Design a protein around this ligand. Structure first.
Ligand SMILES: Cc1cc2nc3c(=O)[nH]c(=O)nc-3n(C[C@H](O)[C@H](O)[C@H](O)COP(=O)(O)O)c2cc1C
Ligand SMILES: Cc1cc2nc3c(=O)[nH]c(=O)nc-3n(C[C@H](O)[C@H](O)[C@H](O)COP(=O)(O)O)c2cc1C
Ligand SMILES: O=C(O)c1cc(=O)[nH]c(=O)[nH]1
Ligand SMILES: O=C(O)c1cc(=O)[nH]c(=O)[nH]1
Lengths: 312, 312
C-alpha cells in the first residue's frame, strides 16, 4: 500500500508538503525540500522586491507550538520565479509558488509574470490572503470586500487555476460568507486552511517579557495550539466548497494528526511548526505513521476516508 | 505579601473567580463557588426564559483543553436575579451576574429589572457579547455595529457601571476597532477577555467521529489551546482602554498562568476549563502558586507587576 494521489493535473507520491514559509526561502531550502520524501513543496510567500522582514527575534517554539512575526522576509519574486522556471526538478515532485503582495496591484504584477511559467512548467499558484505579521497590513481575507477584489483582479490577470491560503475563522457566519466569496471564482481550485492564528502573545514568566521583538510581541500561532481550529476550518470549507479541493494546514505533528485532517476533508496536508522543529526527516515518519493507521483500520486509499468524519 | 484588590467599589480577597458558565448554573453550584477560596464568583449567562440548551454530549475535555457547545442552558433570569437579591451572601465575596440575551431587546428587558438589585445589593453586571454556540446567532462582538447598538441600548436602560465579556480577536485592526467602540461607553468599567475560541472542531481518531453532538461537532475551545490568544487579547485591551479594567480569562491552570495574565494587564483572573476539570479546590492551589512566584520575585502586591509585561 502507498499514499500516491493525483490532484490538479499532477501526481503526488503522498499528501504531505511543507507549509509555506517553512524550509523554503532559499535555493538551499528548496533543494532540501525537493530531496525530502514530501509529496510536494511550496515556496516562501514572496513580494515583488526582496524583504529583510521584521526585527529578530521573530520566531520562537515551545512544547505546544510556535509564535512568529517573520514579516515576509524573502529573496523577492524574481528569485522564486527563476527557481520555478529554471531550477526546480519537476520529475521529483510538484511545486507551488506562494505570493503575498502588500496590495492587489502588487499581486496582479506578480501573477502576470507567473502565468507563462505556469503554462510551460506547471508550477501552481498559492495566493496568500492571510499574512498576520506585516505592520499596518491587516489580513486580506478578514475583509470580504477586499478578498473579492483581490480574487477578481488575480483571476483576470492570471487566467489559470490557482489556490488561496486562508486565515482561520471562528464564526459560522464568516465560514458562510468566506466560502460564498471563494465559490464566485471558478479559477480557485484549492483552498488551504489555515494560516497561523493571528496576533497571539507569548510571555516568559521568568523574564516577564514577550518572546519576539516585532509588534510588541504579537505574532501568529502554529502547532499544537491550533489543531482543533485548523480541523474546523478544513471541514467548514470542505462542506461549503464541494467543487474545490481543501488543503489542510495546522497542528500536524504525527500521522494521526494527518489522519484527522484528511477525515475533515484535506487533500494535501501541510506541515509547518513540526517541520521547523524536527526537520525534513519528519516526512518519512508521517508517511509511515499514516500508513500504519490506515492498515490498522483496513483503509486501502485516502479516498476511502477523506471528508468522512462522523457526526453524532 | 497579599493578593487583595479593591476595584469597582468592592473588595476582593484575591483575583481569582470562576469563568462564566463553569460551576455557576444552580443554587448548589453558586453556594459551592461561594464556599470556595475564590475572590469572587459569576453566574451562568442567562436568558429571559429558562433554557435546556443544546443536545448532549455538549462538553468534552482533553489534555490540552476543552470544547463545548452548551447552548446557554440556564435556570432563567428570574432565578439568577433572585439569587442576587435574596440568596447570595455578600459578606463572603462579590457576585457578578452574566446575561446573554439572544437579542438587544432581551438584554434591555433584563437589565431594566437588574438595575434596582444592583443599586441595592451591589451585584455587578457582565454583559456577554460573545457566545459562539447558539445555532444561527453569531457572536455579537464580531459585528461592530451590532456591538455598538447593544452597548448603547444597555447603557441607556441600565444606567449603572457594567462589564462586557468579549470574544477573542486575531487582527490588530479588530483590536483597534473593538476597543474604540468600548471607549465610547463610560459605563463600561471592565472588559473580560476572552470567551472561548469559537467553532473549533475536535475529532476522535479511533471512532473517526466528532466528540460533541451540536452543530456537527463545532464548539468553543478553552484551556491550554487558548492561553497565548487570551494573553494577546488581555494585553491589547489593557493597552487600548487605559480608563477601564481588564479581566483575564483563558488557559489558566496554574499560578504561573495567572501571573502571565496579570503581567498582560488583568485585574481579576477567571478560571474555566481548569475549574471544570479540577473542581473548586483549584482556588487554594492558584493562590499558593501565585504567592510562590511573587515571593521568588520580591513582589508584595498585584499592582507591582500588573500590566508590566516587557517588550523587546
Ligand atoms: C516561520 C514561519 C513562517 C511562515 N511563513 C509563511 C508564509 O510565508 N506564507 C504562508 O502562507 N504561511 C506562512 N506560515 C504559516 C504556515 O504556513 C502555517 O499556515 C502555520 O504555521 C500553521 O501550521 P502549523 O501549525 O503546522 O505551524 C509561516 C509559519 C511560520 C512558523
Ligand atoms: C462548560 C462551558 C460553559 C461556558 N459558559 C459560558 C457562559 O455561560 N458565559 C460566558 O461568558 N462564557 C462561558 N464559557 C466560556 C468561559 O467563560 C471562558 O471564557 C472560556 O472557557 C475560556 O476560559 P478557559 O480557557 O479557562 O476555559 C463557558 C465555557 C465552558 C467550558
Ligand atoms: O512571513 C511571515 O511573517 C508570515 C506570513 C504568513 O503568511 N504567515 C505567518 O505565520 N507568517
Ligand atoms: O452556553 C454556552 O454554550 C457558552 C456560552 C458562552 O458564552 N461561551 C461558551 O463557551 N459556551
Amino acid at each position: 500500500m502507498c499514499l500516491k494521489l493525483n490532484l490538479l493535473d499532477h501526481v503526488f507520491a503522498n499528501p504531505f508538503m511543507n507549509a509555506a514559509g517553512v524550509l523554503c526561502s532559499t535555493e538551499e531550502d528548496l533543494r532540501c525540500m525537493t530531496a525530502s520524501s514530501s509529496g510536494a513543496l511550496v515556496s516562501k510567500s514572496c513580494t515583488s522586491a526582496p524583504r529583510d522582514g521584521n526585527p529578530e527575534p521573530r520566531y520562537m517554539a515551545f512544547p505546544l507550538g510556535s509564535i512568529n512575526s517573520m514579516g515576509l522576509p524573502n529573496l523577492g519574486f524574481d528569485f522564486y520565479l527563476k527557481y520555478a522556471s529554471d531550477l526546480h526538478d519537476y520529475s521529483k515532485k510538484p511545486l507551488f509558488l506562494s505570493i503575498s503582495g502588500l496590495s492587489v496591484e502588487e499581486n496582479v504584477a506578480m501573477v502576470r509574470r507567473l502565468a507563462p511559467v505556469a503554462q510551460e512548467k506547471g508550477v501552481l499558484l498559492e495566493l496568500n490572503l492571510s499574512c498576520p505579521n506585516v505592520p499596518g497590513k491587516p489580513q486580506v481575507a478578514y475583509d470580504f470586500e477586499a478578498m473579492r477584489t483581490y480574487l477578481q483582479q488575480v483571476s483576470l490577470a492570471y487566467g489559470l487555476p490557482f489556490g488561496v491560503k486562508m486565515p482561520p475563522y471562528f464564526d459560522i457566519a464568516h465560514f458562510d460568507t468566506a466560502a460564498a466569496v471563494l465559490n464566485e471564482f471558478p479559477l480557485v481550485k484549492f483552498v488551504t486552511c489555515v494560516n497561523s492564528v493571528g496576533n497571539g502573545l507569548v510571555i516568559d514568566a521568568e523574564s516577564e517579557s514577550v518572546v519576539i521583538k516585532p509588534k510588541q510581541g504579537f505574532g501568529g500561532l502554529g502547532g499544537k495550539y491550533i489543531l482543533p481550529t485548523a480541523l474546523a476550518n478544513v471541514n467548514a470549507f470542505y462542506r461549503r466548497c464541494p467543487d474545490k479541493l481543501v488543503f489542510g494546514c495546522g497542528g500536524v505533528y504525527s500521522g494521526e494528526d494527518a489522519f484527522l485532517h484528511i477525515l475533515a476533508g484535506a487533500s494535501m496536508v501541510q506541515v509547518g511548526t513540526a517541520l521547523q522543529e524536527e526537520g525534513p526527516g519528519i516526512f518519512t515518519r508521517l508517511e509511515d505513521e499514516l500508513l500504519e493507521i490506515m492498515a490498522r483500520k483496513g483503509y486501502r486509499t485516502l479516498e476511502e476516508f477523506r471528508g468522512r468524519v462522523k457526526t453524532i
